[PDB]
Write a protein that binds this ligand. Sequence first.
Ligand SMILES: [Mg+2]
Ligand SMILES: [Zn+2]
Lengths: 290, 1116, 151, 77, 193, 48, 43, 87
Amino acid sequence: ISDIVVPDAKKEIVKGYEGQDEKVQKQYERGLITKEERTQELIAIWTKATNEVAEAMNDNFPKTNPVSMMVNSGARGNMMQMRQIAGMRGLVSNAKNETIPRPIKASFREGLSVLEYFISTHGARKGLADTALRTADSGYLTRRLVDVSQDVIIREEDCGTERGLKLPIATRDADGTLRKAEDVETSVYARMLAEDVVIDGKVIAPANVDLGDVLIDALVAHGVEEVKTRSILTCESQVGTCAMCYGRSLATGKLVDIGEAVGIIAAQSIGEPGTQLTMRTFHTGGVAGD
Amino acid sequence: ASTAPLRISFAKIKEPLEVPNLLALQTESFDWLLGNDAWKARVESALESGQDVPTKSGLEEIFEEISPIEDFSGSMSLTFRDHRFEPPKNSIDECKDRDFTYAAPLFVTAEFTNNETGEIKSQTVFMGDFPLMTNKGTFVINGTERVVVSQLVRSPGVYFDSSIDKTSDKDIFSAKIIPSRGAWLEMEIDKRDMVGVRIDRKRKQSVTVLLKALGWTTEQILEEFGEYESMRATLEKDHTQGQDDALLDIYRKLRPGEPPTREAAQTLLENLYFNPKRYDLAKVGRYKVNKKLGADEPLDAGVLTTDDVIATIKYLVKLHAGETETVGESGREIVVETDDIDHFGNRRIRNVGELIQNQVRTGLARMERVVRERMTTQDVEAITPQTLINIRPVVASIKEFFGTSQLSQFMDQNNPLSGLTHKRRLNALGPGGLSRERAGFEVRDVHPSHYGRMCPIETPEGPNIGLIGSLASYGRINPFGFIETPYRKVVEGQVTDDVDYLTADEEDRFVIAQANAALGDDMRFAEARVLVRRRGGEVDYVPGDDVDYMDVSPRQMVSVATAMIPFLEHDDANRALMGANMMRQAVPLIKSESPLVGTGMEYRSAADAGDVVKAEKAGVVQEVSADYITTTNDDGTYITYRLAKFSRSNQGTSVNQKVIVAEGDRIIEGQVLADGPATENGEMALGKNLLVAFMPWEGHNYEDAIILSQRLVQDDVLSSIHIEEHEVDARDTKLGPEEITRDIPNVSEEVLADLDERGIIRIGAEVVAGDILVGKVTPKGETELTPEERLLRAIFGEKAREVRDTSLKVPHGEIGKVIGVRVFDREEGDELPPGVNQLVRVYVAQKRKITDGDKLAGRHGNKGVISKINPIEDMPFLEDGTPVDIILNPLAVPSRMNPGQVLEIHLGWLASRGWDVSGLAEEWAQRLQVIGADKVEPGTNVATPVFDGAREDELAGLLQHTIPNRDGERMVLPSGKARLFDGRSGEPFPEPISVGYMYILKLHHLVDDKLHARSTGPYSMITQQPLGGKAQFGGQRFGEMEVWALEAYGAAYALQELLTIKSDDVTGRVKVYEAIVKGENIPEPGIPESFKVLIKEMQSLCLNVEVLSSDGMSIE
Amino acid sequence: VHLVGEVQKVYNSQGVSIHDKHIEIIIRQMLRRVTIIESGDAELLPGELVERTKFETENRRVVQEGGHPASGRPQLMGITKASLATESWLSAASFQETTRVLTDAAINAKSDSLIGLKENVIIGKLIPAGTGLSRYRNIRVEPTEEAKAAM
Amino acid sequence: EGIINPPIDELLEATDSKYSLVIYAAKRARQINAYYSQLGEGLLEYVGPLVDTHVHEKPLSIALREINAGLLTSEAI
Amino acid sequence: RPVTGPGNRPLKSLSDMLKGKQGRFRQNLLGKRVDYSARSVIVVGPQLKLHQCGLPKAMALELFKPFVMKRLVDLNHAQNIKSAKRMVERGRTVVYDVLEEVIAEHPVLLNRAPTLHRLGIQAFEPQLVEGKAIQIHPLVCTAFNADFDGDQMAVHLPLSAEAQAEARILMLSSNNILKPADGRPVTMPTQDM
Amino acid sequence: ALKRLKVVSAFLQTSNSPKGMVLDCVPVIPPDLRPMVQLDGGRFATSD
Amino acid sequence: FDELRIGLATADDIRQWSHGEVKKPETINYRTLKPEKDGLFCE
Amino acid sequence: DSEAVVPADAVSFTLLQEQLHSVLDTLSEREAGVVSMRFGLTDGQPKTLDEIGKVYGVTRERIRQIESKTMSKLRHPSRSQVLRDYL
Ligand SMILES: [Mg+2]
Ligand SMILES: [Zn+2]
């Protein structure tokens, strides 16, 4: 009970907000503001309040406590979970994707109120129903992907061709400097250059060599802005797809073996996070199709 | 007074209304259906009290519905005036033991009256046995306890839906009249800027043809409807005119292929809607349609009228044209607005009474058809009420009602709370209702209307999430079928001690406050500002004297299983869901103990359930004993309660009952005399309370798994009886009869050591897998001795006899001490099904102790498998040596967002070591002193209601002021953590650790059930692959995703063997077994058999699927 | 590029990361067919899906024969349609459609070559992927002569 | 004294592939199992375990040990 | 309307067997049931090595019945094969000793039901262990996406020499450090360590 | 016309005659594949 | 196993597959529990 | 189903066949042969004693006497320990 300390300042700040809030209600009672405008300003004001109390709690906590140790380390949990365990929960999705005007002001440590628990439940069951559905759809998608992706097996040691594919080695280069791509790993790593590269008249990255940290670092240092990687798309193999174009596998960290089933592996990997995605528009916004 | 044992209450607000009879839903519904003395007593009590109630019973109503039958001549008539019951012949205990459906006779007086004879002949007839419902709301059918659960259905009436079509770029409005029984009708306006009607959606048609088909003329039509341009446009574009023209046109459209007939068209239209039989709108249907359409007092019971149809036209178009308020046709002014189906005013529960009433109504409909047919084929003066009625349909329906019904469910007796929860569930799935495949997002999701009428917290987490839910705590059923809920009455800002039951619609009009809102010393509101809720689930506040109703109890929105949890408010809704769903599985233990910390409502949840045996008189006990207890009232009546002892439940757990009362103690009515499974002093007890400490420990409690001492194994703390029952029949076959005998053939001598004289295992003979329970031998089989068998028999001189052994044997992997054997004999007076000469059942009972794999869990949805059972020494003990009985991963509680369990642990520690608080002059001290929970002795239970639980200031102060347990020091620091000396390395843990008492249950996911294995066993017939299930030695399924993974690995040989040798190849299985035992290398797999099945089947569709080789025909 | 980017950003919306090759294989599989247009000299129908390899072979055949090639345009179709319009009816039959595919295969009288994975899992034979390939399975094992010389 | 007792990398570099290694070891293991099940015919073509053997053993472990030692060789047809 | 037959349900049809989730194709040719397999609840045992899994005594005994029979015949603990069958069914101590002797060097494929990605099926070294629940190594738990709330895990047995070869080389639980999705470590969970 | 050409050409190239549309003789599934297996209790178990 | 040729099954082919002809709806004698003559299940 | 060949029963029967045939091979050639025909180990139809006395060239009483002799010899405890357990 003494581990999770609610921020002392919270009460003060929130009552200030609440004070401000009731003023709006007063100036809504006289008809000077439309109900929709009141709802919008209130949702914005409570978003501000919950963000501010989140920051206040983040400052409050000392680094030596259990929850910080097991969240910062990446062991388990996440910042927002501690936010709604210690700080106020905030805006909660009303049924059929709406927001309420009076979000939850108490933390799970302090204990919700009856209606507050009731509104939180409105979102909780929806989430469970949604997950059950997303698992179903993810399974269906995985089956379709595996079916369409089968019959693609690696059946040649080396491709006959030299055509490659142009990918961005490095981008978002600030002024007077070269900056590598933010998502360089998922795109260009584990690919084999179709042809060598010369920048100072000397070969930097030899051909048919999978790329890693040292080589990519060297190539960005030399200042090359693009790269030409051989890839499965440009494969010209008389039988299936060659090993060279697929590049090294990933579960082993070595060149893909002849006869491995890349198709089922790709389908399984693409279908695996289908259950983990679980994302949806927070609110329709009153417009359909936008 | 002494109703329950003392339990300190941490509540802060006094409660006017007590919880109603928690089982009222079933008992009152079935009393109404029976219309017995209790129901009519309730009816007259309500009438003299002024409360509305249906004055007419359920059975007599359905009887009176069937008017006396009239032949084409209408000469004769059969009146079913009076119905009556007689006491059932079989006792409830007798029915359960002898496999008889608990039922009683139902007689009825049939009066035959014929005008031609001018005579009345009265005679009583008997329509069959009627399954009755015991006083604990279970139908004991075929010796098994079923329960019928309510059903959520859209009430009949009008429903208007407003939507938007992207193609049209404009709003669309539709209407649907949903009847109770008849065919359905719809009314869509401006589908393409015109209004049209769906008469069962047969074909496209207009409204003008419908109105003209009715007697209403065009002139009056346009006079009434000249103010809405949509209808004038529809009228003018309609070229057809005249009633006859419209009628013949609509008949041709509805039934093409024959020339139109005026009279047949009129009778068809009358039959489809106006007929009182084909369109019998339920009483709720009319009751809601009059309110919705605004007509003032239409016909109380009957079909829709043309007046209703025109009123619906007017309402629909008023909605379309945009006006929000309009004069109701033949009614007062009303808001015209779209109505959402999901609102709970539109949802109706079919209590068991209405379900069985519908079924018996269908049966009587078949009876009516049968008697009418008999009348058409019978001569006069040879007709008596005795002979004409065939009772087969009614009995066949009320018996098939229980079977093949999604609503007659096998009762679950895992514990009394599982019983109550199965009673109160309102299953949306079932006939004529929302099915699994029809499920959508909207129906499952909680609605604002659900508050107080359907707990949103608890529901199965499976694919049927939210479809099945438990009724609220205070819920009561409106006679039409809607769900009520109480509210206290407020006036001039003063809360009054009056309660009114509001339904799901009357709630919307008013504004409802919150019970939690503080109240001053006087009955006025302490604070002008008070949270309230209003129409549409709004939560806006309204200060000052404006409210009129407030919730009577803060626990209104929570059901019984969810009300059990303590510190519920602090848990996330998801973890509360899991905790409440789990708690319907805890098995009773050898010695049940009430939780140290728990909601104060557990006493009601225990007493209300029918497992506890309470007294119906206020007397003095005279003979207390294990089997039975005798009570004597001052009047003189003696009654001996017979307590069940170790009798199997539905799920296979003991139902042992203890005895709590002393010899001469005084008793009061309803008081608890004998304790039940998972109970203590009449209070609920589904588990024990262990000493829990939160710390990771060597990784044995990694990923939420559990570590517990050997103290629980040693001291029998967590151990459960389990009684399994399996039976055999000595059936007579063509070749001969089966003999239950001790002389089993082709057996050793010592196997039949403990068998009794006739071939029955003795009572108390501990058994293991493979033991012979009851001996049985086949009469004969045509034996053609093989050459090897012939030669061997010749060498050893043994006679292989026609009689063959087929005796029942203990299933593999099973242990236990037999406790009771039952035998039923054909030749004896006992009745058996045909063919089975003798039946034998044996009870094997064991005491399963808490072991590795046996699932364990707490109350707040924290659950895990045991990973290791350390010796008592290795447990990290406390400063005073008390070894912590169980460890738990702390990594759980933050991420799972169930910090209620930490509060529970601290409060349990507080409960175990009492506290004294007197004259402390602290705010929390003042609150506890006024509540009365200031001076608490050690060990006493403590209660924190589900929403008025102890505040954190109270816990902090009490921890500061705990009673010194030994030598004058408190082992727990003010922070709620204590010093833990690691038992293994010995060296104290570097920092204090949280410790306290947590209530842990033993779930029914015991490892002994889950554990299964298979070398080789049975197989299926149509396809030779192994069969599934544990009872039949069934291999686990190597489904599609498994072969996907194996193909991904590239391991092709393993896939080949897993798909051909290890199943689906008859030639390969014996070969692989022989190869392994002989040590020879595995042989080459053949072609599987399932592919051959497919080839033949596709050859039976006239597709010549020919397997071919590159060089001509292939070899197979 | 567009498909890869869209699906990759959809995944990165959460934080999961799937290497682009996995997407690339499927996207290559979707683009495999081509829609034939101006089917004058090729003599087959116009405006139907045809596999790229067959298109190239037919174009080479007709230009060798002297006739001018029939035109074709790239066409993208969903994974479902691509799977259904496959050479191996057995794999198609084991898919969602199990009536239309059987019927049309019967009408066309197409013999299903056993090349592929699922159709070799139905039969129970060895999947041509990994250890089941011809080159790995044809070897012979003997020790060296010096091994026999020692013992 | 375990499944991972013979490390894999030496085998991979010895056979130059991974599936080739498993099929080749499986052929050798089949041969040695069949030899242990000779029970008296003494066919000349058959050859016993080249490396020392325990009183009870699984043939595949012996085959893998032989590959790791390297004295065994394979030639594709 | 279909030919309802009894009236409770449409009657099955030739093609109806050849279609749908329950059709022959997708239920009895792609995914079949298998002999030499088992299932049970799973618990965490940290003292194991990465390439080891526990199989409870009754489970392992019933899995390896052919091999236990062969070994008991060879060691003369049982006279002949039928007496060996009776001896194993009785469950005398000699049977357990032979079992501990025989499971060694025989991989077993542990497998969880969803098997989302190819790391769902992983070979392991079996090992006798008391209780009735499979002991497993927490390092490989996250590869299955398996928690220890309660989660039954199937166990399959590779029979032939080739299958056990693949289970030792390809499917071993120590040669699958890297997840195939993006080639980052998956076999270093984080919950407690 | 495109669909009609597709089907007619598919039939013309194939040797099997179109008259297979109308079956004259109905093949029957072998009995074991539609088992009337005896069931204990004097009852029966039959496939549709 | 090289190709699973499938096509239209003509009447002559169906006759070739058949080893007889079913002539009754008989299945099994109610008393002998044995297959009848020339009906379903006929031996 | 009941028509399935239980692998354990089939393999036990095969082992019984092998053990029994070995046991007869222990006996003399003529004795083993005559008992085999008397009990039809070679062919599913065992031959009566006189029925054996046609191909072998012995009289029905002579073959009977050796049949009695075979049954005795296989009844000594020597060639009985192995076949007792197989039943
Ligand atoms: Mg789980
Ligand atoms: Zn290539």
